[PDB]
Design an enzyme around this catalytic site. Structure first.
Site, PDB file in Angstrom:
ATOM      1  N   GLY A 197     -12.081  -0.394  -8.790  1.00 25.18           N
ATOM      2  CA  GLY A 197     -12.044   0.964  -9.303  1.00 25.18           C
ATOM      3  C   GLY A 197     -10.693   1.469  -9.772  1.00 25.18           C
ATOM      4  O   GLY A 197      -9.650   0.917  -9.429  1.00 25.18           O
ATOM      5  N   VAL A 198     -10.729   2.532 -10.570  1.00 23.32           N
ATOM      6  CA  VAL A 198      -9.529   3.229 -11.019  1.00 23.32           C
ATOM      7  C   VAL A 198      -9.401   4.543 -10.241  1.00 23.32           C
ATOM      8  O   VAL A 198     -10.375   5.279 -10.103  1.00 23.32           O
ATOM      9  CB  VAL A 198      -9.606   3.540 -12.538  1.00 23.32           C
TER      10      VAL A 198
ATOM     11  N   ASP B 287      -7.164  -5.962   4.336  1.00 26.31           N
ATOM     12  CA  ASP B 287      -6.344  -5.969   3.140  1.00 26.31           C
ATOM     13  C   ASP B 287      -5.168  -5.006   3.194  1.00 26.31           C
ATOM     14  O   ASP B 287      -4.839  -4.364   2.199  1.00 26.31           O
ATOM     15  CB  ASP B 287      -7.202  -5.670   1.904  1.00 26.31           C
TER      16      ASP B 287
END
Ligand SMILES: O=C1Nc2ccc(S(=O)(=O)O)cc2/C1=C1/Nc2ccccc2C1=O
EC number: 2.7.11.22
Length: 276
Positions: free
Chosen positions: A14-15, A115
Site C-alpha cells: 500500500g501507499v 518486520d
C-alpha cells in the site's frame, strides 16, 4: 471524507498519504493495492498501547479500500538519515524503551510483528515512538501474510530464520530490536546484506560462526552448512562506539544467535540500563 492527500510513504502492500478530514485534523491514509486486510485490522483492533499506531476506521469502496490511522510526522529511518552517525544516548535509550514496551505488549497479546525496522517505527515531535506496519505479522499462530524471503528486507532478519527455521517465536522480534538498537548508536545498519547468503555471513563475521557448543542443535537447521567460514566473535567495544557497559550487556542479550538464549522483551525492560 478526507482531502489534500500527500504521499508520505510506500510499502509493498500500500501507499500511505497524509490527509485532512473536514475539520482540519490530520490522519494517515493507507490505500491498499488490492482477507489479508481483515487479519491486519483484527490485530490493530486488539492492540491498544501508547507505542502502537492507532487505527480509526476502514472505508470499503468496491474499487477502493483505505485504512485511516493516527499521523506521525516522521519515521526512525529519516531521523537516522539526517543524523550524524547515530542518535544521542538519551534519545536512543528513550526510543529503545518505547519500542520494548510496544513489543512486550504485542508479545503478551500473542502478536509477532516479524518486520521491525527503522521505516516502521514512527516518531512525533514529542519524541514518542509508535510501531506500525503489521502486514507480515502473526496473531496466535495465524499469519496476516505468509512469511517469505522476497518481500521482507534482510537486514533485520534473525540467523535461525535465515537458515530455514519455521519455528515461529517472539525471538524473531527481539533480534530485530537488537539490530535497531545497534543502528541507533552507530547511525548505520549493523548487517546490510543484499542476499540471504550475504546476510548470514555478515552476521557471522561480527558475532561469530555458530557451533554446537554455543548453539546446540544448530546442525539441524535446514540450511545449516557444515562448511561455513569460521569467524571468531568480535569484542562489542570494537564495532559499537559510545555505548556504556550496561547498554552493551543488554545488546549482547538481544543478539544471541541461538534464539533460545535471547532475552525477552519483558526481561529487557527490567535491565539495569533503564531505571530499574
Ligand atoms: O503517520 C503514519 N501513520 C501510519 C499508520 C500506518 C502505517 S503503515 O506502515 O502503512 O501500516 C504508516 C503510518 C505513518 C507514517 N508516517 C510517516 C511519515 C514519514 C515517513 C513515513 C511515514 C509513515 O509510514
Amino acid at each position: 471524507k478526507y482531502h489534500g492527500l500527500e504521499k508520505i510513504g510506500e510499502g509493498t502492500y500500500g501507499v500511505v498519504y497524509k490527509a485532512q478530514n473536514n475539520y482540519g485534523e490530520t490522519f494517515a491514509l493507507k490505500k491498499i493495492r488490492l482477507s489479508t486486510t481483515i487479519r491486519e485490522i483484527s490485530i490493530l483492533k486488539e492492540l491498544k498501547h501508547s507505542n502502537i499506531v492507532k487505527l480509526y476506521d476502514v472505508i470499503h469502496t468496491k474499487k477502493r479500500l483505505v485504512l485511516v490511522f493516527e499521523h506521525l510526522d516522521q519515521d526512525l529511518k529519516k531521523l537516522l538519515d539526517v543524523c550524524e552517525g547515530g542518535l544521542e544516548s538519551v534519545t536512543a535509550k528513550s526510543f529503545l524503551l518505547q519500542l520494548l514496551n510496544g513489543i512486550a505488549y504485542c508479545h503478551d497479546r500473542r502478536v509477532l510483528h516479524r518486520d521491525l525496522k527503522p521505516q516502521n517505527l514512527l516518531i512525533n515531535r514529542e519524541g514518542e515512538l509508535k510501531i506500525a506496519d503489521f502486514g507480515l505479522a502473526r496473531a496466535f499462530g495465524i499469519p496476516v501474510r505468509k512469511y517469505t524471503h522476497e518481500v521482507v528486507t534482510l537486514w533485520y532478519r534473525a540467523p535461525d530464520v535465515l537458515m530455514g527455521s519455521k519455528k515461529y517465536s517472539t525471538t524473531i522480534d527481539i533480534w530485530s530490536v537488537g539490530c535497531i538498537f545497534a543502528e541507533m548508536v552507530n547511525g548505520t545498519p549493523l548487517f546490510p546484506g543484499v542476499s540471504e547468503a550475504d546476510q548470514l555471513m555478515r552476521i557471522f563475521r561480527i558475532l561469530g560462526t555458530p557451533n554446537s557448543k554455543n548453539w546446540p542443535n544448530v546442525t539441524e537447521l535446514p540450511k545449516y552448512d557444515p562448511n561455513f567460514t569460521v569467524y571468531e566473535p568480535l569484542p562489542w567495544e570494537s564495532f559499537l562506539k559510545g555505548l556504556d557497559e550496561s547498554g552493551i550487556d543488554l545488546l549482547s542479550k538481544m543478539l544471541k544467535l541461538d534464539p533460545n538464549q535471547r532475552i525477552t522483551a519483558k526481561q529487557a525492560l527490567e535491565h539495569a540500563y533503564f531505571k530499574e
